[PDB]
Write a protein that binds this ligand. Structure first.
Ligand SMILES: [Mg+2]
Ligand SMILES: [Zn+2]
Length: 322
């Protein structure tokens, strides 16, 4: 476990945000990349704007963030920058659907996003499972997600870190569940079933947001939507990130090789030609449907779908030499 120093959050409480960004965070395609220094501050801004200033305890929040920060590894993809990006997509969905969600749901969904990949190694579930690695035996399914949540909790169990103290033991235990379920939903295995169910539910007319089971399923889709949002950015950003993903996918497949296993096309660095054919598969199979159902459920999220289409169009172009 890694704790933030004394004078990191104190100088971060000093943090104020420039006007130009204030007006641009609100945008779905907004890219946080150009503002590394400013990332902790931006989350806070997003919290405040969505949850309220007097609402969260400030000393605690700032300690919480820099400790979340320091427990993200320096891996190519699933790092501190993934976290804030994913957090940002949430804020964008939330802002456009603010009232649909309660003040606890919004509190918890934003904190969950930031924490959803905590202590990621750059290794997939399947890897840790087909091998072991103690984590696949401790958490048998949704291996890494279960770790991610656990770590969130450990971070909350630190001196001055428990931002949720000021809640009622009723609310406190409610929000830990919203998080747990949220962090778990980002296991992409679940997503496929969850979308069809939701597809089904919307298509028949059954979907009801007062239904806690329905609700949970909707929140699920949101988490998938955010965890993937880099496919919703402008093309050059989108393309750069794919490098980082693969950087990890390959380092993984290499270790499969290193210990006598033959990795799929997607984690085979000698198979870089098939990538754009895989990306097209992934957009069509996974991302397009994901943002499609989500737009039906929540119409203020159609922009996310467009961005994704546009990016699919680009991938098609790479395939045909252009
Ligand atoms: Mg993850
Ligand atoms: Zn993720």
């Amino acid at each position: 476990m890694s704790i933030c120093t004394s004078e990191e959050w104190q100088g971060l409480m000093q943090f104020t945000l420039p006007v130009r960004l204030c007006k641009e965070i609100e945008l779905f395609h907004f890219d946080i990349g150009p503002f590394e220094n400013m990332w902790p501050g931006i989350f806070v801004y997003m919290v405040h704007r969505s949850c309220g200033t007097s609402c969260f305890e400030l000393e605690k929040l700032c300690r919480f963030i820099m400790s979340v920060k320091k427990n993200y590894r320096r891996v190519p993809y699933h790092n501190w920058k993934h976290a804030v990006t994913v957090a940002h997509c949430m804020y964008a969905i939330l802002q456009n659907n603010h009232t649909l969600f309660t003040d606890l749901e919004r509190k918890g969904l934003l904190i969950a996003c930031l924490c959803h990949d905590l202590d990621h190694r750059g290794f997939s579930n399947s890897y840790l499972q087909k091998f072991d690695h103690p984590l696949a035996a401790l958490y048998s399914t949704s291996t890494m997600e279960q770790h991610h949540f656990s770590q969130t909790v450990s971070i909350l169990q630190l001196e001055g870190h428990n931002i949720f103290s000021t809640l009622s033991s009723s609310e406190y235990e409610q929000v830990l569940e919203i998080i747990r379920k949220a962090i778990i939903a980002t296991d992409l295995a679940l997503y496929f079933g969850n979308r069809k169910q939701l597809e089904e539910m919307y298509q028949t007319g059954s979907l009801n947001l007062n239904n806690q089971s329905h609700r949970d399923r909707v929140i699920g889709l949101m988490m998938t939507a955010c965890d993937l949002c880099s496919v919703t950015k402008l093309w050059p950003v989108t393309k750069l990130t794919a490098n980082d993903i693969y950087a990890e996918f390959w380092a993984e497949g290499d270790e499969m090789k290193k210990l006598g296993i033959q990795p799929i096309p997607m984690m085979d660095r000698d198979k870089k030609d098939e990538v754009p054919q895989g990306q097209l598969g992934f957009y069509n199979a996974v991302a397009i449907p994901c943002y499609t159902t989500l737009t039906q459920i929540l119409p203020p999220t159609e922009p996310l779908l467009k961005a994704c289409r546009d990016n699919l169009s680009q991938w098609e172009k790479v395939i045909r030499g252009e």
